[PDB]
Structure 1
């Protein structure tokens, strides 16, 4: 079955320039008997390749290409089924963009290429080609943000309590600064939030979720606290199945020596979406009281920034599924960069969570993320502040 594969990559500027002549001669000669067609674009620093052929033949070739030491930062942009070949000729075509001016490159592409009965601008492949020609260095990973240039550098449990809390830090690595702490619920035996809520009767889970926060506020009250935000997770139901849940949280946090502005509530969009008029009453009560709110797991389940027409949170936490393998996904790169920009324009804080690798941290930083949560920096610490690992040079 005919398939299209589109990727971008970049060269090593430190090494001798790649023989473009030998590359394209051997490519075109290998591709032809395998039924592989397409075009290669080169701007002096970046490669852009469109590959056409069977799914099995493109998977075999991309594996060899990803593995090729001539280039790095290989980012897949498109991979889908096709009805016709766009490129024709007994081999791989190549354009050195540096030697074309203004729109001569798009002119040479359109010489031998077929884009159907409608205008070429109606083809996604052509639009992706145009975007690389007009502005290719856009998602080119900067040299200081190359992952290869980076490397990475006590408290007891409480079984007597009905619940305990683990703390995970939100960090800003550029200033080596802890931004805030998120409280994660744990069972008396140190079990997960799943295990904890499973032990609670279903009709009592909303009330338990709200009242467990008294133990989170108390813990935060005994810690070197001072002036970091405390994020707590709540179901929206737990907030409005109660006569004054906002006022209850208010009394509970103030008795622990915390401030309204220091406490942030984390809810997801999936949880909120079914009940806007119910939630907007709760958010209003939170705002007036002085408490903050984040939209958590933004990317998982129902997620869109058109949600921001209903209300604007103080913070948006980008889901770990958008963060996962962002270094190779053109789709995830575009989406996260879009979130960063929208929130910057609206004055909404952005946190990327589930950050596990340097490659994730580096690419998230290139698209504008400054606040990070994940195992790479700091793991959740039961009833205390865990150690933070900072990325250092070399």
Structure 2
């Protein structure tokens, strides 16, 4: 089974130059007996390599390549099965693009390779035309940042539920943007643990009802000028005819403003019925409450949803964040949600941010609002401690 692997990487710019003639010859000598072929592209700052061979030969080679100190920021762009070798007879071969006139490098490629409808070919072009695009800038290296560190956890009695709060942060302004309320059982357990105790047919009712205790928690904080974010299933919003009006009454009694309350609905559940949700949407807009699409990029129905309606906020799902520093796929998609939301005036939050590596690459694709264990953990009935990225 033939397979194609493509990645891009960067040189260490303050270190002595790597002898690439030696690298490439040694590589070509090693690749061909093992049934590995392909090319290397160098532009002065970045590498771009295509590899062809069996799944097993490429995996073992790429592990060595990943851990090679002679470059950094290895980002995979393509891993897929292949119909034929595009570089038959070429173990390895470098093209220094700086030695080439316009179109010249591509025309050399085409003369030893074995045409514009190919995914490998289009990416090559894309690297030659604009390689420095998803290059991680020097200030935004994870090694040039440092996370720096008191919460008051409290049990509230006489309550059928309680809530933890997680900060959504804007590290560029060292500012809390908003807090998300996350439901907990009476004994501090998970959302699942909470809803499992409630009878199945009362779960929509309970979901709506429980929000009153989150508003109360926001009121006694006393929150001030920060937004409150709240997870509701669409079905909970259809429970009572005046579910929106009840939310309003409840949040005002907690001393909150409507523009201060934001509703989080999951991407998968909105696409179920646009007929009944739009009546709720209209009620939320008229009342002044804001809407967010939670876990965007997970439930398949992505960016075309904006044709039907536009939320105030979009929360990028954790799956798009996991290993976004090594995935070109994820980088491209996330960066396209950013740019689309910027033109539409939609707030973008990245979720499940756990590592400096994740924060840096997300910052480099243009995300400013962040939510994750890296910055802030859920804190039962209070504001938890917040960690900020500090420069080096």
Whole-angstrom distance in 2 between the partners of 1:179 and 1:8: 35
1:83 Cα deviation after fit: 1.5
Deviations 1:244-302 (A, max 9, x none): 00000000000111001000000012111111011000000000000000000001123
Distance 2:32 2:205 in 1: 67
Taking the aligned partners of 1:376 and 1:368, their CA distance within structure 2 comes to 18
Contact 1:351 1:373 in 2 (8 A): yes
Offset at residue 159 of structure 1 (A): 4.2
Asked whether the equivalents of residues 377 and 389 of structure 1 are also in contact (C-alpha less than 8 Å), the reply is yes
Q: CA RMSD in A?
A: 0.8
Tell me which residue corresponds to 1:81: 81
What SS does the corresponding residue of 2:217 show, helix, strand or coil?
helix
1:310-329 deviations in Å (ceiling 9; x for gaps):
10000000000100000000
* Contact 1:31/1:92, CA 8 A, preserved across alignment: yes
**Structure 1: stretches of 5+ with no match in the other structure:** 114-119
Q: Deviations over 1:171-228 (max 9, x none)?
A: 0000100000000000000000000000000111111100101100011001031100
Please give the alpha-carbon distance, in whole angstroms, between the structure 2 residues aligned to 1:196 and 1:129.
Answer: 52
Structure 2 unmatched ranges of 5 or more: none
Kindly report structure 1 stretches of 4+ aligned residues shifted beyond 6 Å: none
Q: Does 1:359 align with 2:357?
A: yes
In the aligned structure 1, how far is the partner of 2:219 from the partner of 2:204? Answer: 24
Aligned to 1:121, the other structure's residue is in SS state coil
1:34 counterpart residue number? 34
Deviations 1:100-155 (A, max 9, x none): 12111111101111xxxxxx101110000000000000010101110011111122
Q: Which residue of 2 aligns with 1:126?
A: 121
CA drift of 1:90 comes to 4.7
Match of 1:47 in 2: 47
Matched residue of 1:137: which SS?
coil
Distance 1:371 1:50 in 2: 35
Verify the 8 A CA contact 1:163 1:186 in the aligned structure 2.
yes
CA 1:277–1:231 in structure 2 vs 1: closer, same or farther (change >3 Å)? same
Report the count of equivalent residues.
388
Question: 2:181, 2:231 within 8 Å by CA — same for their partners in 1?
Answer: yes
Task: Judge which range, 79-88 or 132-141, deviates more.
Answer: 79-88
Shift of 1:89: 2.8
* Superposed displacement of residue 91, structure 1: 3.0
In 2, distance between residues paired with 1:222 and 1:55?
58
What secondary structure is seen at the aligned counterpart in 1 of 2:120? Answer: helix
For residues 56 and 205 of structure 2, what CA distance do their matches in structure 1 show? 54
Q: C-alpha displacement at 1:303, in angstroms?
A: 3.0
Shift of 1:378: 0.4
Q: How far apart are 1:158 and its partner, in Å?
A: 2.0
Kindly state the Cα deviation for residue 160 of structure 1 after the two structures are TM-superposed: 2.8
Contact (CA 8 Å) 1:231, 1:265: kept in 2 or not?
A: yes
For 1:391, the equivalent position in structure 2 comes to 389
Q: 1:160 touches 1:188 (CA, 8 Å); kept in 2?
A: no
Structure 2 CA distance, aligned partners of 1:324 and 1:165?
26
Task: Please tell me whether the aligned partners of residues 39 and 90 of structure 2 are also in contact (alpha carbons under 8 angstroms).
Answer: no
